[PDB]
């Protein structure tokens, strides 16, 4: 019935019992969470301690409870505080909510440091964990087989590599006309979304060569690149 | 269809947020417009 047993099993001493409650909470975490938020601070203390090999599991559980309360912001932060088991969350259907929050946070910071150096993805401030969550999103997009999804999130975060990969994959030549349309949607959308000179330059240069490689593409779309960047070399 | 029912809360958050902003903006600008015209 109630959660009251579960709460008690944590507080009671000896390692084994504490370890056991974590698994128990996880089973009913979505169903029942009202009573378990009482003991939210305690769950956090078990993570700090290194004796449990299920510390990672302890951070994972608390984060589901925050999300459920209604506190989406509290959830993602806790999840990223630990930097443990975001992989599970990314591919979980019911909570793609806190994932959205992590994505929304990352793209802003990523934009700032792009101006400074084009690659900054493995820099100390932009934790490699953040880079990993982001690429997991890109794979989810192509699984639903929409590539607009994958493009649009990456333009916001000033990612040069991910965009380059996308344009390159459309060199399959599934059909030539059909490849051009997707490319044209991004060049119009660049004008408006991107205001940063450095990032804007870099992306148009890439797009020139991928188009240029197909001798079969319209030169209206190639013209459009030449004029925007307004480069004498292109 | 089944896949997209599950993955929806990523997408749904951002678009529904944005729409709410339009509803409150229109409301405000036209209320203040009436005040300005009278004075």
């Amino acid at each position: 019935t109630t959660a009251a047993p579960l709460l008690a099993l944590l507080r009671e001493n000896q390692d084994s019992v504490k370890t056991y409650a974590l698994e128990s909470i996880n089973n009913v975490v979505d169903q029942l969470w009202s009573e378990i938020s009482n003991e939210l601070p305690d769950i956090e203390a078990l993570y700090d301690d290194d004796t449990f090999s299920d510390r990672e599991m302890a951070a994972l559980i608390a984060s589901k409870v925050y999300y459920n309360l209604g506190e989406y912001e509290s959830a993602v932060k806790y999840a990223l505080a630990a930097k443990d088991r975001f992989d599970i969350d990314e591919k979980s259907q019911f909570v793609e909510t806190i994932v959205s929050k992590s994505i929304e946070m990352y793209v802003q910071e990523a934009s700032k440091q792009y101006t400074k150096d084009e690659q900054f993805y493995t820099k100390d401030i932009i934790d490699p964990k953040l880079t990993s969550i982001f690429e997991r999103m890109i794979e989810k997009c192509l699984k639903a087989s929409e590539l607009k999804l994958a493009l649009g999130i990456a333009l916001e975060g000033y990612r040069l590599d991910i965009i380059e990969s996308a344009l390159k994959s459309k060199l399959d030549q599934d059909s030539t006309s059909e490849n051009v349309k997707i490319i044209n949607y991004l060049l119009t959308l660049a004008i408006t979304t991107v205001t940063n000179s450095k990032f804007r330059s870099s992306i148009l240069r890439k797009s020139f060569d991928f188009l240029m490689n197909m001798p079969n593409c319209d030169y209206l779309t190639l013209n459009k690149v030449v004029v925007n960047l307004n480069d004498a070399g292109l | 269809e089944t896949h997209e029912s599950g993955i929806k809360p990523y997408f749904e958050q951002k678009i529904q947020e944005t729409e709410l902003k339009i509803r409150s903006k229109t409301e405000n600008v036209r209320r203040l417009e009436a005040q300005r015209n009278a004075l």
Binding site: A144, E146, K148, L149, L151, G152, I153, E156, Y185, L189, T192, T193 | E1, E4, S5, K8, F11, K14, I15, T18
Partner: peptide, 15 residues
Amino acid sequence: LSNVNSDIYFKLKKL
């Protein structure tokens, strides 16, 4: 509901 999701990236970002 695959259709709505696409529009967030394209149209609505500009608006």
